[PDB]
């Protein structure tokens, strides 16, 4: 399953090309100003088979709790109504989500003892670097 390694709270650090992700995503001006200056903490908790990933941020705090697998409804923090899924890959956590046709992916993997995000939408590529805090 997923390594435990991921479990915790997570700092983001770095954040490369999000504004044009968020774009890509349909994200308006005003909440993609908020969204840059966001430096939210992640917190990766399991139950079981049950893993949840929460995000808290002054602009916007959201949360998933799912099995590996098995699809299962998500409202994103830009208020999008999915159908996701996340599995793991060579031990990334990989999550797809759908909607309208359209799809992004979520790409969360460890690299020397940091958590990166790797998040595309239609060619767009932001990575996102956490520190374990
Ligand atoms: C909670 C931070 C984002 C706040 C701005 C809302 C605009 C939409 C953001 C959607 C993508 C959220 C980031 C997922 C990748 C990650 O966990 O680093």
Known sequence: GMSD???????????????????????????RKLGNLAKPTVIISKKGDIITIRTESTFKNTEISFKLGQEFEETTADNRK????????????????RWDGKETTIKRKLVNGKMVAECKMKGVVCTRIYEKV
Request: hydrophobic residues 40%; charged residues 20%.
């Open 82 to 97: 999915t159908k996701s899924i996340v599995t793991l890959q060579r031990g990334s956590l990989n999550q797809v989500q």
């Open 5 to 31: 390694k991921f479990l915790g709270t997570w700092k983001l650090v770095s954040s490369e090309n999000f504004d044009d992700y968020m774009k890509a995503l349909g994200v308006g001006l005003a909440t």
